[PDB]
Amino acid sequence: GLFGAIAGFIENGWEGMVDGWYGFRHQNAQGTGQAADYKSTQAAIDQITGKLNRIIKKTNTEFESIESEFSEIDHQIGNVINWTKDSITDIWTYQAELLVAMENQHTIDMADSEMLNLYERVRKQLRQNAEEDGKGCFEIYHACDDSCMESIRNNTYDHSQYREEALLNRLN
């Protein structure tokens, strides 16, 4: 994937996570938690909604019959219509195939990017109090309880609180 997270440095998805598209899983002394990230989940859904609104739509152009169903037409003009209709059908078939293939590509990468933008947001929050696992996780180098974990998820984590403790744990 373009941004390297989904089907990339993150091994796989989580069938357990039903309350959102992106989110967190932590482990600390006191146990284990899971929570969706609303902002990144909604940013992805909103962007896909806009595609559906643009794509799931037809023109408001009135088309009358040029081919009689129950009677013969002149063979020359019938062939001119058959050539034109097949030419227009080839265009729309191609346009549809391209549209869908291009949007599917864009959707997959857009979703990949939102995962990465959430990850990079957490990396900068934690600053020097954590290190990258490689597998989409952050090994935090201090005691981080559920209120600390909630602060990282809700973006109220202040690295300086835990800096003095964390740098010592990182160094020895």
Binding site: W21, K85, N104, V122, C137
Partner: protein, 317 residues
């Protein structure tokens, strides 16, 4: 030893395959169809002032064939022709038939204006036949008149009727010429005199001479012709007998959607797109039911399915 926080994304057990620019078999968490495959076999006429012609052919509407009696006039925003629809109770064809049919289906209603044509005392304008049956008895085309002599042998008087167009719009007028196969049939009907017919007007003008397999057990034929009478113009028919004459003329008002189908009616459902097989009431942008459609439609494509991704790559555990 150290605590951990892990970022991740949702997945699902049953993913869906879509095609991307690079990958033909790309599994995603969710997808939705863009090409409509399902077709309702019912003409969806909700919110439509419509006229199902049924057994009536649009030409026959203008001349008043027995099957068309219920459709000689009206107003509509939709018109529905059917297969094997009767146009002629007495055998024949229109001079420029398929050009006329499409003009009628392009219009949104017909109103007939009386020509007010009187004939003499010798002539008899009520020429009924066993072919065009109406009301359990011998009859004729409602908007035309069969002109035969009251004296069964006597020669036909060289009569001329005229029609001026009163209304501000164009008026459509139709007539024709009766020919039997033999000469002996023609002579008793309208006299031995080698007569002919000629209609004259502002733009249109032509002469016609009464000249195969049998249809509806009749020996003779009735060949129909037509032209648009201009507003403030005079159509005068000059004939010497043996030509059927228009009692009324037609006026086409506005425009409407000319549907052609075999499928039955349903006023519960609604639609803007129609085809021979039925209706297409889909929100999707593309469609693979028929290239022949009418109205506001999804575009025809040579594709069974095209799945648009509505979620991320599916990466199971």
């Amino acid at each position: 030893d150290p605590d951990k926080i892990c970022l991740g994304h949702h997945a699902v057990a049953n993913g869906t395959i879509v095609k991307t620019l690079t990958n033909e078999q790309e599994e995603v968490t969710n997808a939705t169809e863009t090409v409509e495959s399902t077709s309702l076999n019912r003409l969806c006429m909700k919110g439509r002032n419509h006229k199902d012609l049924g057994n009536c052919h649009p030409i026959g509407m203008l001349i008043g064939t027995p099957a068309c009696d219920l459709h000689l006039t009206g107003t509509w925003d939709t018109l529905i022709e059917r297969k094997n629809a009767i146009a002629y109770c007495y055998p024949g064809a229109t001079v420029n038939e398929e050009a006329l049919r499409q003009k009628i289906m392009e219009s949104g209603g017909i109103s007939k204006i009386n020509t007010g044509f009187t004939y003499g005392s010798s002539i008899n304008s009520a020429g009924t036949t066993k072919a065009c049956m109406r009301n359990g008895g011998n009859s004729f085309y409602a908007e035309l008149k069969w002109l035969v002599s009251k004296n069964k042998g006597q020669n036909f008087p060289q009569t001329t009727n005229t029609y001026r167009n009163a209304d501000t719009a164009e008026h459509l007028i139709m007539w024709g010429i009766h020919h039997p196969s033999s000469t002996q049939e023609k002579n008793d009907l309208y006299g031995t005199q080698s007569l002919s017919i000629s209609v004259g007007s502002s733009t249109y003008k032509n002469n016609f001479v009464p000249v195969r397999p049998q249809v509806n057990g009749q020996s003779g034929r009735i060949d129909f012709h037509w032209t648009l009478v201009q507003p403030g113009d005079k159509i005068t028919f000059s004939h010497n007998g043996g030509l059927i004459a228009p009692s009324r003329v037609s006026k086409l008002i506005g425009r409407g959607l000319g549907i052609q189908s075999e499928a039955p009616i349903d006023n519960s459902c609604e639609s803007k797109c129609f085809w021979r097989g039925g209706s297409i009431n889909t929100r999707l942008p593309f469609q693979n039911l028929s290239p022949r459609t009418v109205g506001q439609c999804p575009k025809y494509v040579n594709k069974k399915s095209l799945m648009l991704a509505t979620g991320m790559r599916n990466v199971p555990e």
